[PDB]
Write a protein that binds this ligand. Structure first.
Ligand SMILES: O=C(O)CCC(=O)C(=O)O
Ligand SMILES: O=C(O)[C@@H]1CCCCN1
Ligand SMILES: [Co+2]
Length: 286
């Protein structure tokens, strides 16, 4: 499948981070209750917690297009530096959600598009809090590293993923801005980024040998191992030069070769759910 372009994913600004104050709030987050919502998108320990949402209540853990300035949750009110960053670098009344998104060692989010279930869209922006060179984000055919203190706009309507392959977890502050806002006006009190060369793409060329190894999962794929296989497929594009949606084609061919109708139907359902269309509240299972 092919996907219409949108606003360009890029660095909106760079900010200084107070390491002492940040360290304190990150230490709280290391012991905090992360949501299990959207675990249907997680390949391992990809997870988030709400700092601001519609109601200001901990129970509210899913997103919907809405019209009100986001209210801090008890967790958000307990993280004074992160609360200050939200106050300082964004317009309060434009925020619809604010979250911390943590990826732990060898985890990723499955390649997907956001907003399919929404009546509208958000402008999604990431402020990188704690990362390392073994953490990357992807978009289509591209891989890139979002660095500490950078505020990025991500076009979440293009297929994309994110992973962490370090022992140390990766934390981003992720803000959903009301979708009609002027993107260029979203980040406040920032330094404009100095021009950069592209992130260096160190991934391996994709070969016939690698593809045949993968398609060979047809001999063992089953309901019992379907999730592990999907996760393996999802992680390949962090290390091999392929498009992040290619895994859905691989899965379809694996299942075609196996010849079991249930697995073929499931593979079609996965592509549909992650990339094409979803209803509000719809969850995918294995
Ligand atoms: O970097 C991440 O953890 C998530 C990227 C993503 O899929 C999103 O923000 O929609
Ligand atoms: O838009 C959201 O909040 C979620 C994030 C995780 C992937 C699915 N969509
Ligand atoms: Co996303």
């Amino acid at each position: 499948p092919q996907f219409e372009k949108g606003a360009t994913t890029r660095i909106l600004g760079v900010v200084q981070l107070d390491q002492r104050r940040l360290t304190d709030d990150l230490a709280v987050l290391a012991k905090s209750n992360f949501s299990s919502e959207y675990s249907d998108f997680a390949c391992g320990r990809w997870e988030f917690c709400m700092l601001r949402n519609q109601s200001g209540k901990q129970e509210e853990q899913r997103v919907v297009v809405h019209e009100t300035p986001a209210l801090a949750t008890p967790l958000g009110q307990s993280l004074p530096y992160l609360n200050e960053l939200l106050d300082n670098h964004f317009d309060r009344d434009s925020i619809r959600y604010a979250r911390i998104i943590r990826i732990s060692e060898n985890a990723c989010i499955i390649p997907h598009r956001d907003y399919l279930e929404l009546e509208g869209k958000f402008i999604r922006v990431h402020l990188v809090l704690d990362t390392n060179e073994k953490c990357s984000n992807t978009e289509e055919n591209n891989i890139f590293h979002m660095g500490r203190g950078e505020i990025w706009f991500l076009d979440a309507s293009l297929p994309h993923s994110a992973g962490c392959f370090s022992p140390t977890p990766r934390l981003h502050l992720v803000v959903d801005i009301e979708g009609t806002r002027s993107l260029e006006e979203v980040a406040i009190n920032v330094e404009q980024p100095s021009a950069r060369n592209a992130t260096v793409d160190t991934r391996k060329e994709w070969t016939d040998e690698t593809l045949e190894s993968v398609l060979g999962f047809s001999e063992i794929i089953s309901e019992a191992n379907y999730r592990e296989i999907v996760a393996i497929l999802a992680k390949l594009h962090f290390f091999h030069k392929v498009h992040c949606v290619d895994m859905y084609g691989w899965l379809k061919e694996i299942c075609r070769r196996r010849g079991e109708p249930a697995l073929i139907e499931k593979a079609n359902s996965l592509e549909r759910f992650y990339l094409i269309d979803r209803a509000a509240g719809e969850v995918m299972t294995y």
